[PDB]
Design a protein around this ligand. Sequence first.
Ligand SMILES: [Mg+2]
Ligand SMILES: [Mg+2]
Ligand SMILES: [Mg+2]
Ligand SMILES: [Mg+2]
Ligand SMILES: [Mg+2]
Ligand SMILES: [Mg+2]
Ligand SMILES: [Mg+2]
Ligand SMILES: [Mg+2]
Ligand SMILES: [Mg+2]
Ligand SMILES: [Mg+2]
Ligand SMILES: [Mg+2]
Ligand SMILES: [Mg+2]
Ligand SMILES: [Mg+2]
Ligand SMILES: [Mg+2]
Ligand SMILES: [Mg+2]
Ligand SMILES: [Mg+2]
Ligand SMILES: [Mg+2]
Ligand SMILES: [Mg+2]
Ligand SMILES: [Mg+2]
Ligand SMILES: [Mg+2]
Ligand SMILES: [Mg+2]
Ligand SMILES: [Mg+2]
Ligand SMILES: [Mg+2]
Ligand SMILES: [Mg+2]
Ligand SMILES: [Mg+2]
Ligand SMILES: [Mg+2]
Ligand SMILES: [Mg+2]
Ligand SMILES: [Mg+2]
Ligand SMILES: [Mg+2]
Ligand SMILES: [Mg+2]
Ligand SMILES: [Mg+2]
Ligand SMILES: [Mg+2]
Ligand SMILES: [Mg+2]
Ligand SMILES: [Mg+2]
Ligand SMILES: [Mg+2]
Ligand SMILES: [Mg+2]
Ligand SMILES: [Mg+2]
Ligand SMILES: [Mg+2]
Ligand SMILES: [Mg+2]
Ligand SMILES: [Mg+2]
Ligand SMILES: [Mg+2]
Ligand SMILES: [Mg+2]
Ligand SMILES: [Mg+2]
Ligand SMILES: [Mg+2]
Ligand SMILES: [Mg+2]
Ligand SMILES: [Mg+2]
Ligand SMILES: [Mg+2]
Ligand SMILES: [Mg+2]
Ligand SMILES: [Mg+2]
Ligand SMILES: [Mg+2]
Ligand SMILES: [Mg+2]
Ligand SMILES: [Mg+2]
Ligand SMILES: [Mg+2]
Ligand SMILES: [Mg+2]
Ligand SMILES: [Mg+2]
Ligand SMILES: [Mg+2]
Ligand SMILES: [Mg+2]
Ligand SMILES: [Mg+2]
Ligand SMILES: [Mg+2]
Ligand SMILES: [Mg+2]
Ligand SMILES: [Mg+2]
Ligand SMILES: [Mg+2]
Ligand SMILES: [Mg+2]
Ligand SMILES: [Mg+2]
Ligand SMILES: [Mg+2]
Ligand SMILES: [Mg+2]
Ligand SMILES: [Mg+2]
Ligand SMILES: [Mg+2]
Ligand SMILES: [Mg+2]
Ligand SMILES: [Mg+2]
Ligand SMILES: [Mg+2]
Ligand SMILES: [Mg+2]
Ligand SMILES: [Mg+2]
Ligand SMILES: [Mg+2]
Ligand SMILES: [Mg+2]
Ligand SMILES: [Mg+2]
Ligand SMILES: [Mg+2]
Ligand SMILES: [Mg+2]
Ligand SMILES: [Mg+2]
Ligand SMILES: [Mg+2]
Ligand SMILES: [Mg+2]
Ligand SMILES: [Mg+2]
Ligand SMILES: [Mg+2]
Ligand SMILES: [Mg+2]
Ligand SMILES: [Mg+2]
Ligand SMILES: [Mg+2]
Ligand SMILES: [Mg+2]
Ligand SMILES: [Mg+2]
Ligand SMILES: [Mg+2]
Ligand SMILES: [Mg+2]
Ligand SMILES: [Mg+2]
Ligand SMILES: [Mg+2]
Ligand SMILES: [Mg+2]
Ligand SMILES: [Mg+2]
Ligand SMILES: [Zn+2]
Lengths: 59, 137, 204, 122, 73, 118
Amino acid sequence: AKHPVPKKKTSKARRDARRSHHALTPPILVPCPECKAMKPPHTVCPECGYYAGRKVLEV
Amino acid sequence: MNRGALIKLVESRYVRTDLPEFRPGDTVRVSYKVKEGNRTRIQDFEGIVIRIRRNGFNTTFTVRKVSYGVGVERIFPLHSPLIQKIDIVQRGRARRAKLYFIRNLSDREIRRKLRADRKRIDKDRAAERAAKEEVQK
Amino acid sequence: MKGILGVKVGMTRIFRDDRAVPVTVILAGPCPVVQRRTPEKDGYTAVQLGFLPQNPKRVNRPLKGHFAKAGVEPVRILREIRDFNPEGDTVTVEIFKPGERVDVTGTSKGRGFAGVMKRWNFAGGPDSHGAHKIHRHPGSIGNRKTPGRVYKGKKMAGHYGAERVTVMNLEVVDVIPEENLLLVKGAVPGPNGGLVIVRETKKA
Amino acid sequence: MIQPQTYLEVADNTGARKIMCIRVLKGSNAKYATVGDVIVASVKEAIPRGAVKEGDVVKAVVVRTKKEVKRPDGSAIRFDDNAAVIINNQLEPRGTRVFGPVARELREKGFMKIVSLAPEVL
Amino acid sequence: ADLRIDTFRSSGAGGQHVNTTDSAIRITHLPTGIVVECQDERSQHKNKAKALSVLGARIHAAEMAKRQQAEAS
Amino acid sequence: MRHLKSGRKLNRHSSHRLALYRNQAKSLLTHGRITTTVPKAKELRGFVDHLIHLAKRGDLHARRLVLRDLQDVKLVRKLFDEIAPRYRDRQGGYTRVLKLAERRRGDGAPLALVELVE
RNA sequence: GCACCUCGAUGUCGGCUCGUCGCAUCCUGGGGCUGAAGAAGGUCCCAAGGGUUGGGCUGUUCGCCCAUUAAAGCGGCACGCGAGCUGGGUUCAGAACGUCGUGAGACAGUUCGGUCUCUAUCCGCCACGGGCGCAGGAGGCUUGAGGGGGGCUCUUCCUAGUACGAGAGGACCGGAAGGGACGCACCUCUGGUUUCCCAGCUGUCCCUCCAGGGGCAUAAGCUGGGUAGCCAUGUGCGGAAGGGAUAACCGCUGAAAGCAUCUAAGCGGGAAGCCCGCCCCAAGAUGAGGCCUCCCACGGCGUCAAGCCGGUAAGGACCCGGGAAGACGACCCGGUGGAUGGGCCGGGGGUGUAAGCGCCGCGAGGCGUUGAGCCGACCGGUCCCAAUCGUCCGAGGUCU
RNA sequence: AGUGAGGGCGCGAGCGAUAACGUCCGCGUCCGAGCGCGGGAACAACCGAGACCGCCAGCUAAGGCCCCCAAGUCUGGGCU
Ligand SMILES: [Mg+2]
Ligand SMILES: [Mg+2]
Ligand SMILES: [Mg+2]
Ligand SMILES: [Mg+2]
Ligand SMILES: [Mg+2]
Ligand SMILES: [Mg+2]
Ligand SMILES: [Mg+2]
Ligand SMILES: [Mg+2]
Ligand SMILES: [Mg+2]
Ligand SMILES: [Mg+2]
Ligand SMILES: [Mg+2]
Ligand SMILES: [Mg+2]
Ligand SMILES: [Mg+2]
Ligand SMILES: [Mg+2]
Ligand SMILES: [Mg+2]
Ligand SMILES: [Mg+2]
Ligand SMILES: [Mg+2]
Ligand SMILES: [Mg+2]
Ligand SMILES: [Mg+2]
Ligand SMILES: [Mg+2]
Ligand SMILES: [Mg+2]
Ligand SMILES: [Mg+2]
Ligand SMILES: [Mg+2]
Ligand SMILES: [Mg+2]
Ligand SMILES: [Mg+2]
Ligand SMILES: [Mg+2]
Ligand SMILES: [Mg+2]
Ligand SMILES: [Mg+2]
Ligand SMILES: [Mg+2]
Ligand SMILES: [Mg+2]
Ligand SMILES: [Mg+2]
Ligand SMILES: [Mg+2]
Ligand SMILES: [Mg+2]
Ligand SMILES: [Mg+2]
Ligand SMILES: [Mg+2]
Ligand SMILES: [Mg+2]
Ligand SMILES: [Mg+2]
Ligand SMILES: [Mg+2]
Ligand SMILES: [Mg+2]
Ligand SMILES: [Mg+2]
Ligand SMILES: [Mg+2]
Ligand SMILES: [Mg+2]
Ligand SMILES: [Mg+2]
Ligand SMILES: [Mg+2]
Ligand SMILES: [Mg+2]
Ligand SMILES: [Mg+2]
Ligand SMILES: [Mg+2]
Ligand SMILES: [Mg+2]
Ligand SMILES: [Mg+2]
Ligand SMILES: [Mg+2]
Ligand SMILES: [Mg+2]
Ligand SMILES: [Mg+2]
Ligand SMILES: [Mg+2]
Ligand SMILES: [Mg+2]
Ligand SMILES: [Mg+2]
Ligand SMILES: [Mg+2]
Ligand SMILES: [Mg+2]
Ligand SMILES: [Mg+2]
Ligand SMILES: [Mg+2]
Ligand SMILES: [Mg+2]
Ligand SMILES: [Mg+2]
Ligand SMILES: [Mg+2]
Ligand SMILES: [Mg+2]
Ligand SMILES: [Mg+2]
Ligand SMILES: [Mg+2]
Ligand SMILES: [Mg+2]
Ligand SMILES: [Mg+2]
Ligand SMILES: [Mg+2]
Ligand SMILES: [Mg+2]
Ligand SMILES: [Mg+2]
Ligand SMILES: [Mg+2]
Ligand SMILES: [Mg+2]
Ligand SMILES: [Mg+2]
Ligand SMILES: [Mg+2]
Ligand SMILES: [Mg+2]
Ligand SMILES: [Mg+2]
Ligand SMILES: [Mg+2]
Ligand SMILES: [Mg+2]
Ligand SMILES: [Mg+2]
Ligand SMILES: [Mg+2]
Ligand SMILES: [Mg+2]
Ligand SMILES: [Mg+2]
Ligand SMILES: [Mg+2]
Ligand SMILES: [Mg+2]
Ligand SMILES: [Mg+2]
Ligand SMILES: [Mg+2]
Ligand SMILES: [Mg+2]
Ligand SMILES: [Mg+2]
Ligand SMILES: [Mg+2]
Ligand SMILES: [Mg+2]
Ligand SMILES: [Mg+2]
Ligand SMILES: [Mg+2]
Ligand SMILES: [Mg+2]
Ligand SMILES: [Mg+2]
Ligand SMILES: [Zn+2]
């Protein structure tokens, strides 16, 4: 290695140009069939601990 | 669509049955069909079977044989048409599936290490002699 | 240019005239036609062949409509055997006689991001004699201030395999029309389950 | 498999005992020699008053390998050593006897004399 | 016409010059077979000069030995 | 490459990853329900499955087999004498996993629970 | 030679790795002449498509030699390639010989030793996605402009011991077979690996004393084996045939120039080369192509915005179970009208006779129960467990 | 005060090889300082020409006038 190094300060444009893809996607939620409070899908509801219309997690 | 059975199905037409069971350590004698120049003939290769790699129709085995100072191993496809017969010369009590170690052993040592398998010998000369009995006339 | 779709089921040797022969088996028929290309309506000749029945409980309106015109229940997939126009409404394994030579196309196995050694069979460095961390490296890729660049198609590391590759002039060994199978002397690309095209060879 | 620098027992009475291969002839750049192929080899030791001397550059034909050779019939065969047999340019065997079995491959290759003298083809 | 002259990089010391300068010489006198190398001084030319000089001297004493093994013989 | 290979690595070596599957088993069995990371859970479900299914065999050999991992004679008793006969009618699938909504703060690890069924 | 760029640095030889171009061609292809009988060989002409070995010596380039070979071509690319490696050589400090010098020291004289720098911003290059476009919207299937890949070659045999030749020798053309090297794919064979699939073993600590086991000795303690997968040493297959236009060259017809001339009109033959053909990429081919099939009236009006809105269509996306797909994305299958994964069962396969008990031996042990027990992937089966339930986007088609 | 590294081109000499974008003198020229403008594709010094500032006016220079690209696919006569 002879220690490579940026030849020119990246332009303010070309900087953000890179960060084009960095913006994040919102979470994916569903209404819980029980409370209708929001939950991520395929997971056990934090509010009531109901899944597959059955009780599991105590909360 | 059991592709497995499909393959094994293809094989079935090439499957033999006429062959005796045997394990490593047993000493056997394959009569092989060979071709000297143009003609066909049978050549007997007799030695200790040192390995068997089972795999359905595609199963095969290796026989080891000293021959005029030179040790020779030979690998036979179990279901080949070029095998007229397989005679069991003497059954032996091995201890592992691959007898490779006897590649480096004095005959006195091979002898002591691979002793005769009394059970499978006794049961063999008990049965088959029981089969000689049943088919009376 | 006769042809047929199928699935590489597996390999296994067989025996013939006291010779062993490596054989890859291929489940071929049946293949119903779905649409026939014609210069008048398509600019060229070919046939859209279907293969493997689809669950109508998965088919959609555009596909079902296509299938209806051809007058044939749903099928898994379609591929075109170019310049081949069959008289039957179904192409069977029967089209190949034991003896014929065939070309088999199949999507190769997928090595993923592969090193230059596995891909292009580069020599790599030495495993010893002072080699500072280049034991599998591609080494030099160019010159100096002329050309002052790397040419296109420089052999380099990337994705290897998982691509269309046709193996040429393979011997049809056998046909099991009752099982719709097909035996082939040699080795066919892709994994035991892959899609394949068997086709009449283009060698003389 | 027998590349250059490979040693081999001589399988005959040429007086040679062990020769080292220096070139496999089958080809303009072939990697390895096998049963039936011919190699130019050098004599690395020999017995007194033998025919060939020690250090003679000679030709020989490989009659036995430790690397098992396949056969069209699906079978294969492997010996316990790498052995060969000294021959002249006309490819006649230089000795008169040959000890230890040889591979049936030799016959096909048209080495008819060597095959006969050998006490067993395999 | 019957000389074969080769040039190549000299051996031993010289810095970068010795590394990038086919200064050494070798002349092969095809008829007889005698060969002289020379990597004395830094100029290739001067080395050819020396080599061409010794080459002459070596052919001469070859013909001198020849005319002796003829005269005495 | 990796083609057609079962079983996870979980950034542990052999010596380790094994003790994991054990102490994870020993905990699951003594508590009936535990919470672990998603992939750690999906491995574990198969493990206790063969163990339990083994205890359904009830014999001393099988018992000595499960003992190899669980080590605790006391726990093993509970597995045979109380856990297993509850599962006599069921064939395979003694374990339930379920993903949890809350990942854990310190590293955004997606969580899940693993439990024995009724 | 000059001293024009670079002394606020353009790292110098050889090797290795990777090559790419030139043709003044080493080989193979075609051809003229020959002091060419034939087999050869010489020289010249065309031809750069591919090919162009392995070792001994030396740091060596060069070169010599060994064994082959169709041949072991020569050059350009900062005498290609040190932000790709090497560091033997050269070119620091140590030290020594010869040598020069009173000397300190010095040497295109030699000898032994001697720090080669983890992070790529831009171009370039290999791969892979996100956006948008494709002047209705979708699902499939395609066309091939353009581009890439490949392109080698020997030996034996037949023809035929024929033409040729005093003889020894020994063909053209046409047909056959077996090779080497290289490329692609593959795992049936052969053969490796197979981090816990089975077994054996030492020491030690532990459980529970015996027995049976467990941790550790590597990040497998060691050893003997080992499926699936990934693989070469293993297996198949490729270079072609063929068509067309040609090079040197060979001819026909034929003036200018009554004859003759392959050429100036015109025509035929003619290469491993060119264009096709074979394989692969390919409609960002913005020149955005084509076929099949599916979807529907805008719902309020937007004044000028040739659309501003918003539930739907055909369909797509999310999420989840996964995958010989894969770094991530992507791609592929599946999601209860389901066998996608896990478990379980079966088969296959590996290991090679479990534990327990009985028997024999003082005992180490042996023998029987027993091909037992254990049994990861491969091939299947089975709703026991897990893909619950759900959410979002998406036409309503501008003009002559 | 500055300058006392000059350079190119033409011409006349020496050196050099009747080589060098070589060197060294003499006469001249321009660049230097006119890398401002037009031509010569691009181009310090070759051709035209010395830019005080403005203009959507005009004539010419060199070099051009088929399209990129301003102006004749101009006329008359030859050669290739
Ligand atoms: Mg993103
Ligand atoms: Mg024997
Ligand atoms: Mg019997
Ligand atoms: Mg009986
Ligand atoms: Mg489809
Ligand atoms: Mg290679
Ligand atoms: Mg490789
Ligand atoms: Mg080093
Ligand atoms: Mg499957
Ligand atoms: Mg011998
Ligand atoms: Mg090779
Ligand atoms: Mg000697
Ligand atoms: Mg044979
Ligand atoms: Mg003799
Ligand atoms: Mg012969
Ligand atoms: Mg012979
Ligand atoms: Mg004999
Ligand atoms: Mg030279
Ligand atoms: Mg001579
Ligand atoms: Mg980590
Ligand atoms: Mg177990
Ligand atoms: Mg939390
Ligand atoms: Mg000057
Ligand atoms: Mg410059
Ligand atoms: Mg420079
Ligand atoms: Mg090179
Ligand atoms: Mg010759
Ligand atoms: Mg020549
Ligand atoms: Mg000449
Ligand atoms: Mg040596
Ligand atoms: Mg050396
Ligand atoms: Mg030295
Ligand atoms: Mg030749
Ligand atoms: Mg030669
Ligand atoms: Mg030569
Ligand atoms: Mg040479
Ligand atoms: Mg060169
Ligand atoms: Mg040294
Ligand atoms: Mg030095
Ligand atoms: Mg230095
Ligand atoms: Mg220096
Ligand atoms: Mg020194
Ligand atoms: Mg002095
Ligand atoms: Mg002195
Ligand atoms: Mg004095
Ligand atoms: Mg010198
Ligand atoms: Mg030194
Ligand atoms: Mg670090
Ligand atoms: Mg479109
Ligand atoms: Mg499109
Ligand atoms: Mg094309
Ligand atoms: Mg092309
Ligand atoms: Mg004759
Ligand atoms: Mg004739
Ligand atoms: Mg003759
Ligand atoms: Mg386990
Ligand atoms: Mg104990
Ligand atoms: Mg024990
Ligand atoms: Mg395996
Ligand atoms: Mg290979
Ligand atoms: Mg081939
Ligand atoms: Mg032909
Ligand atoms: Mg042609
Ligand atoms: Mg022409
Ligand atoms: Mg011409
Ligand atoms: Mg003529
Ligand atoms: Mg002609
Ligand atoms: Mg004429
Ligand atoms: Mg005439
Ligand atoms: Mg006439
Ligand atoms: Mg013509
Ligand atoms: Mg053309
Ligand atoms: Mg085509
Ligand atoms: Mg395509
Ligand atoms: Mg389209
Ligand atoms: Mg309205
Ligand atoms: Mg208004
Ligand atoms: Mg998914
Ligand atoms: Mg069972
Ligand atoms: Mg078994
Ligand atoms: Mg045990
Ligand atoms: Mg089983
Ligand atoms: Mg497991
Ligand atoms: Mg399992
Ligand atoms: Mg599985
Ligand atoms: Mg002054
Ligand atoms: Mg003059
Ligand atoms: Mg002025
Ligand atoms: Mg100045
Ligand atoms: Mg000017
Ligand atoms: Mg200027
Ligand atoms: Mg003019
Ligand atoms: Mg004018
Ligand atoms: Mg007139
Ligand atoms: Zn709720």
